Each structure stands twice: as structure tokens, then as C-alpha cells.
Write a new protein. Sequence first.
Length: 194
Amino acid sequence: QISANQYFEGIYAKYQNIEDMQATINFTLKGLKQTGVLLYKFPDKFIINLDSNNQVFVSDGEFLTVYVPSLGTSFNQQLLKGSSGGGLMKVLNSEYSVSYTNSPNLEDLDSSEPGKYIKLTFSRKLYKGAATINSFIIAFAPDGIIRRITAFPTSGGREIVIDLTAVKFNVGILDSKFKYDPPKSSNKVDNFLY
Ligand SMILES: [Cl-]
Ligand SMILES: [Cl-]
Ligand SMILES: [Cl-]
Ligand code: NA
């Protein structure tokens, strides 16, 4: 058996040599299930297009912008106020400490019973500042592929559960294609999502 820190060293190294990731994404926010497709451009950019409605979620690793085309405008908040950013892997690696959620063994996604997933708990290093998310539990399938990210707001409010399926790496995302930061016309909001 290897330690959680060694397991995550291996995850970290895997994701430093990937250009991009596409996935089917389900996530829970404000009591609603949102479903769509994630395009993540490493290290720190993403866009989510939703299947059933016209909203678009965009992040540059510092701000999370939601486009609401039925209203003709967008709203942005800090993605993780208190973080220095740099993308998921750098944040987890530098601002959180890691442990196995239950054990070093392969477990079910939801319980400690036998299954196919490694589950890591990431706990905020408060000497790096408090943040709006104090902890994450991330479940990894056996090729270091992320299956689920659960984010626990520091407020103690409802957790945010992100399910990733049909993960595909290096699909080809052009750099000019997308603008990931909030546009000039965007409306800053304190925290409308967590
Ligand atoms: Cl609900
Ligand atoms: Cl925190
Ligand atoms: Cl603009
Ligand atoms: Na859509």
C-alpha cells in the first residue's frame, strides 16, 4: 500500500502532461441538477455547455462566469475566493492536505464497501488562507481518471457534487476559440452559486 500523498503525486504528474479533457458533467447547484459537457483546457480554463438550457459556465481559474443569453448578460463571481488559483491540480497540491477518505483500498463511489475507486479527502491548509470551499472528496477510477468531485462549502451549506463520465483526453481545443475571463459587460456578484 502507498500513502495518499504518494497516490496524489501520481495523479498530479498525470495531469501535468495532458493538454485538455472533455467530459459529460452532472453537477448540483442551488438545489438543481445541471447536465452538460465540460471542456477543460489545462492547467486552469474551462467551459461547460448545458444540454437542456442555454446557459454557459466559463472559468479562467480565477473567476466563474455564467452567461444567461435569455437575459442578454452574464454574472461572475470568484471561483474559489481565498485561493491563488492556477487550476485544480495546483490548488489541490498547494492549498490542501490529502488523506484517504476511508482507506487505501478500492471502494464504492458512495461507501467504504469494495468497489473500483480510490477516494481522497483534501483539507484546506488554513495557513494558506480560508477559502469558500474548505474540503473536497475526489474519487478516481483506476487510470487516474476523475469520476466524482464533492466540494464542501466552508459555510457548512449543501455540498456541490460534480459527476464526470465519458472522460476523453486531448480532444483538441483551440486557444483562440474561447475567452475564459469575464467580459467587460459582465456583472460581478459576491457568491451566487455556493
Ligand atoms: Cl433540493
Ligand atoms: Cl476553508
Ligand atoms: Cl469584453
Ligand atoms: Na445549451
